[PDB]
Amino acid sequence: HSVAVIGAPFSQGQKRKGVEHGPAAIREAGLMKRLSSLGCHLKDFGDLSFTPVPKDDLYNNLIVNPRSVGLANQELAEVVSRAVSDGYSCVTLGGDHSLAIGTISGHARHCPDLCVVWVDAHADINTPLTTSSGNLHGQPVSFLLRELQDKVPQLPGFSWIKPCISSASIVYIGLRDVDPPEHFILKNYDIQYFSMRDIDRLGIQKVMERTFDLLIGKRQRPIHLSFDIDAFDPTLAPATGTPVVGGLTYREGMYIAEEIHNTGLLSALDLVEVNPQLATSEEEAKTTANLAVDVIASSFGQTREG
Amino acid sequence: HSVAVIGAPFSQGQKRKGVEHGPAAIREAGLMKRLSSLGCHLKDFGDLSFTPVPKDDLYNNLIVNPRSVGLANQELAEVVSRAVSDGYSCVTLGGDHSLAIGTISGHARHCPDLCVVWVDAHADINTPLTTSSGNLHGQPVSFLLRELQDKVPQLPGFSWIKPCISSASIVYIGLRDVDPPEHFILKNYDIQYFSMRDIDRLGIQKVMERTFDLLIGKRQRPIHLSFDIDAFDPTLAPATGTPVVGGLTYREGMYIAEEIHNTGLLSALDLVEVNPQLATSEEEAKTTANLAVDVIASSFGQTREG
Amino acid sequence: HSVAVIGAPFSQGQKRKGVEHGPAAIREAGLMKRLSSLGCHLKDFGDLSFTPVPKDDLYNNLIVNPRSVGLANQELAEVVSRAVSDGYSCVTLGGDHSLAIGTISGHARHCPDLCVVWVDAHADINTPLTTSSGNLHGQPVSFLLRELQDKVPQLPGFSWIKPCISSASIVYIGLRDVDPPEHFILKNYDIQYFSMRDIDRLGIQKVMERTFDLLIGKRQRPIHLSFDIDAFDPTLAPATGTPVVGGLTYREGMYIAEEIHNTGLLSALDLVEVNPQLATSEEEAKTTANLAVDVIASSFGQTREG
Ligand SMILES: N[C@@H](CSCC[B-](O)(O)O)C(=O)O
Ligand SMILES: N[C@@H](CSCC[B-](O)(O)O)C(=O)O
Ligand SMILES: N[C@@H](CSCC[B-](O)(O)O)C(=O)O
Ligand SMILES: [Cl-]
Ligand SMILES: [Cl-]
Ligand SMILES: [Mn+2]
Ligand SMILES: [Mn+2]
Ligand SMILES: [Mn+2]
Ligand SMILES: [Mn+2]
Numbered sequence: 001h002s003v004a005v006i007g008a009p010f011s012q013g014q015k016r017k018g019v020e021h022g023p024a025a026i027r028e029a030g031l032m033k034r035l036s037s038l039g040c041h042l043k044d045f046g047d048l049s050f051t052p053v054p055k056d057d058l059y060n061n062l063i064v065n066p067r068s069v070g071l072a073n074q075e076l077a078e079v080v081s082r083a084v085s086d087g088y089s090c091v092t093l094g095g096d097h098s099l100a101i102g103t104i105s106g107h108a109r110h111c112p113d114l115c116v117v118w119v120d121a122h123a124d125i126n127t128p129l130t131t132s133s134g135n136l137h138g139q140p141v142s143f144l145l146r147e148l149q150d151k152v153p154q155l156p157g158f159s160w161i162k163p164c165i166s167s168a169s170i171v172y173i174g175l176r177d178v179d180p181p182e183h184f185i186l187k188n189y190d191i192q193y194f195s196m197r198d199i200d201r202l203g204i205q206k207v208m209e210r211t212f213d214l215l216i217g218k219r220q221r222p223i224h225l226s227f228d229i230d231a232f233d234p235t236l237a238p239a240t241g242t243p244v245v246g247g248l249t250y251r252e253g254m255y256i257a258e259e260i261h262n263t264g265l266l267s268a269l270d271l272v273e274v275n276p277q278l279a280t281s282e283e284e285a286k287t288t289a290n291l292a293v294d295v296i297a298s299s300f301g302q303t304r305e306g
Numbered sequence: 307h308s309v310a311v312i313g314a315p316f317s318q319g320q321k322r323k324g325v326e327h328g329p330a331a332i333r334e335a336g337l338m339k340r341l342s343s344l345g346c347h348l349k350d351f352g353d354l355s356f357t358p359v360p361k362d363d364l365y366n367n368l369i370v371n372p373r374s375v376g377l378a379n380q381e382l383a384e385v386v387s388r389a390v391s392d393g394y395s396c397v398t399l400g401g402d403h404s405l406a407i408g409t410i411s412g413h414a415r416h417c418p419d420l421c422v423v424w425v426d427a428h429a430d431i432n433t434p435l436t437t438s439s440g441n442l443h444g445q446p447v448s449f450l451l452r453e454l455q456d457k458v459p460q461l462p463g464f465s466w467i468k469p470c471i472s473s474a475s476i477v478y479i480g481l482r483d484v485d486p487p488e489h490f491i492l493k494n495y496d497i498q499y500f501s502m503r504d505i506d507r508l509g510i511q512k513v514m515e516r517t518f519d520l521l522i523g524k525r526q527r528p529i530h531l532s533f534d535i536d537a538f539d540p541t542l543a544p545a546t547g548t549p550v551v552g553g554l555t556y557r558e559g560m561y562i563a564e565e566i567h568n569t570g571l572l573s574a575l576d577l578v579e580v581n582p583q584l585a586t587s588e589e590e591a592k593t594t595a596n597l598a599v600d601v602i603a604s605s606f607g608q609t610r611e612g
Numbered sequence: 613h614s615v616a617v618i619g620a621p622f623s624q625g626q627k628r629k630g631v632e633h634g635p636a637a638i639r640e641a642g643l644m645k646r647l648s649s650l651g652c653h654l655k656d657f658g659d660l661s662f663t664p665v666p667k668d669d670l671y672n673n674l675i676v677n678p679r680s681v682g683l684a685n686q687e688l689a690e691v692v693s694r695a696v697s698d699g700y701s702c703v704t705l706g707g708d709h710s711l712a713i714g715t716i717s718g719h720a721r722h723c724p725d726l727c728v729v730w731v732d733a734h735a736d737i738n739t740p741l742t743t744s745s746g747n748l749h750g751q752p753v754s755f756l757l758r759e760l761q762d763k764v765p766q767l768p769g770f771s772w773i774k775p776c777i778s779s780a781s782i783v784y785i786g787l788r789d790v791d792p793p794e795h796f797i798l799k800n801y802d803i804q805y806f807s808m809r810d811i812d813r814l815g816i817q818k819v820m821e822r823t824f825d826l827l828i829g830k831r832q833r834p835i836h837l838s839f840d841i842d843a844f845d846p847t848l849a850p851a852t853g854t855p856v857v858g859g860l861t862y863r864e865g866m867y868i869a870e871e872i873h874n875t876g877l878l879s880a881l882d883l884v885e886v887n888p889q890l891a892t893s894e895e896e897a898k899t900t901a902n903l904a905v906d907v908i909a910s911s912f913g914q915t916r917e918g
């Protein structure tokens with residue numbers, strides 16, 4: 001199958017400097033030639049350059065870089081819909097997870113019935129209303145779920161975003177650090193998730209059976225994999241903004257990816273939050289980058305059996 | 307609920323120097339404001355200062371610092387029964403595991419019907435008759451079980467100790483390094499345990515279902531959680547006196563703690579054997595201390611899903 | 613039962629220097645008294661000294677040290693069939709995995725109906741016409757399977773070797789790095805294997821149920837356990853020549869061993885590829901050495917339960 005690669009060097013969804021280098025790190029870890037090695041037909045859109053927004057201040061005094069994030073995502077959305085439109089499976093390399101706003105919005109533009117698999121240590125479902133930090137990379141899901149739009153203040157530059165997917169079309173895997181408001185939202189709207197605790201009881205295998213039952217149980221449909229590198233234990237992925245011990249194992253991470261590929265329904269994938277600068281050493285940075293590449297490669301066919 | 311915290315910088319239950327700094331390390335890892343963050347009402351008794359015993363030599367030429375250990379434990383037993391008395395859930399930060407003699411003694415003093423959940427790589431049930439090292443931190447359970455009574459030589463400074471719980475009131479989790487004599491006694495008095503193998507075959511959640519069936523199946527009763535940091539795999543908890551490979555996973559460790567909290571029956575908790583000096587680097591020592599806090603925090607409510 | 617130990621300090625099945633020090637490392641990690649401690653009757657054959665072959669270059673310009681490996685194996689083959697003959701369960705401590713050519717040949721010499729459990733990160737089933745490196749430690753299985761001999765060129769010094777076991781009498785456990793040609797062979801001859809992926813999905817316990825069904829389902833028969841230390845994750849077994857991430861867990865490896873011991877059919881065991889010189893530190897070397905001993909001890913009765 002054909003794969004498209006887009007580098008999104010964005011970092012204004014949070015305050016740590018360095019996530020804008022994520023794309024370069026992953027690329028330098030051999031992502032590209034690793035993909036043809038599988039046999040994929042490649043289309044590299046290069047690394048996007050987003051238009052900054054001068055004097056983009058706090059909305060209501062906490063939401064950070066609203067219109068800067070809204071514009072970058074609007075641009076990314078057009079490139080992603082373009083690739084998905086030409087039949088490509090879109091691979092977006094992040095910066096921060098706020099980019100999921102644009103990639104899922106651009107993807108949904110052509111595959112309205114898409115479902116989402118969110119692999120992350122966090123739920124990123126805070127709204128401008130419940131956030132404590134004001135950092136938009138922890139609010140992506142808010143602006144995408146239809147049942148939430150009534151409790152999601154509209155931010156400057158977010159005009160264009162239009163809530164698409166239903167709360168039943170997204171499943172979380174790996175949650176291990178959820179804020180109380182986020183927990184209220186997940187329970188209230190019955191959003192399905194499998195925390196590390198659920199994985200400790202059911203096992204990654206049983207977890208994937210179910211998430212696919214929820215999403216594609218009654219019918220085939222486009223799958224969107226938004227993979228946050230911090231979903232892996234910090235010992236496996238040091239180079240990241242918000243590490244949280246007790247994460248996914250290298251095998252589990254690879255198992256999730258392998259299982260998604262076996263569905264044959266992957267239409268778009270996000271690999272985000274890889275921050276080279278936050279690594280203690282050169283090796284730590286390289287370890288994370290390689291881990292990122294493995295997840296992507298494995299999502300497109302790479303096997304542990306050959 | 308209200309929580310009491312007692313630091314017992316004791317190290318004479320064994321030979322390595324450094325366990326006396328365990329409390330400070332755990333404290334310096336945020337334990338205190340971490341517990342408040344949960345909503346617990348805290349009463350910090352500070353770090354106790356045990357009275358030493360000059361010229362406290364080997365009894366029968368092997369048992370080490372008998373009277374020094376017997377006095378420190380007596381002493382601790384009173385602070386603990388004081389706290390338990392005022393309705394506090396007593397949290398003791400060790401030095402070595404010989405301290406359990408005091409904490410369980412003092413706790414039983416007010417909750418005679420308490421049951422014990424011992425999470426350790428070792429069973430710590432050697433008697434002064436069966437020990438090979440002579441260190442007392444590997445003999446705690448001996449002085450506490452009633453069925454062992456008459457098979458436990460009386461040492462200098464141990465006169466005050468009176469066997470409280472029965473063998474049927476303690477359950478082991480994590481065992482992987484058991485001496486032949488301990489195995490003989492575990493089998494002879496039918497004491498229940500779940501070795502690393504049992505956990506491998508049953509799953510950590512199936513393990514917790516069972517320990518609570520044995521302990522609190524027929525009735526509600528106070529639970530004493532004695533947690534030896536070496537129950538965790540050495541890669542997760544480096545800073546400790548007697549590492550043993552193939553231990554508990556970070557997740558399983560947290561799972562045990564979460565499950566205990568879910569019983570709502572936790573009265574006291576021991577977090578022992580954290581030895582900073584035994585760490586290779588500064589980060590390894592911090593890793594162990596942070597793991598210690600996560601265990602305690604988790605035992606009192608901290609969640610992986612907010 | 614009675615056990616025989618044979619040290620094979622051979623390293624010419626590959627290019628890295630150091631594997632010849634594997635036996636000493638394992639021995640110096642307490643192997644011998646660890647086996648007595650179990651109750652086993654030991655017969656140490658010491659460390660063999662293989663006759664070098666001067667001017668033993670590449671056959672067809674790639675196959676490395678052909679006759680040197682062929683001669684070393686023929687000699688080992690006699691010592692092994694000697695021990696197996698006197699009723700001993702034969703334990704060979706490697707150098708490199710090419711030694712399996714000798715150990716399995718010698719073993720087969722008396723127990724023609726033996727079955728093989730191959731615990732390795734690799735399949736080591738490349739033939740002289742498919743290898744890329746030319747190193748013979750990646751081709752052992754080729755000279756042993758009967759259905760392959762037709763596509764296996766005859767090398768200098770291999771005259772004596774005679775294909776013994778059938779393709780259905782060998783099961784792989786832990787595969788996670790297979791070359792395209794190897795994959796073709798496995799599929800083509802229906803050779804059974806449980807890759808790290810199959811393990812993540814079925815669990816180590818289920819894996820063993822199955823391999824034993826394939827091998828000893830219809831009848832009891834001798835078991836040859838060829839255990840490459842690189843089957844363990846690099847974090848558990850650093851000191852080895854070809855590290856591959858996402859491998860067996862210490863607990864899983866010990867589970868495999870314990871399970872094989874439970875069958876009571878172990879005849880010979882290979883513990884290969886331990887290379888102390890590849891360790892970054894003294895401790896890393898010691899860790900790998902101890903792991904090797906545990907696997908052997910466990911395969912002969914050692915329990916995590918006592
Ligand atoms: N609850 C956190 C979420 S951190 C989200 C970061 B990441 O994209 O990595 O999940 C907040 O709003 O500050
Ligand atoms: N069997 C050992 C027990 S070491 C006990 C130490 B600890 O408290 O960590 O279990 C002995 O008596 O030397
Ligand atoms: N495919 C590799 C195999 S490396 C085999 C080494 B070992 O014995 O550790 O599996 C080759 O032929 O170079
Ligand atoms: Cl603090
Ligand atoms: Cl039979
Ligand atoms: Mn995220
Ligand atoms: Mn995250
Ligand atoms: Mn202990
Ligand atoms: Mn212990």
Ligand SMILES: [Mn+2]
Nearest residue numbers: 733734840842
């Ligand atoms: Mn190997």
Ligand SMILES: [Mn+2]
Nearest residue numbers: 709732736840
């Ligand atoms: Mn091998």
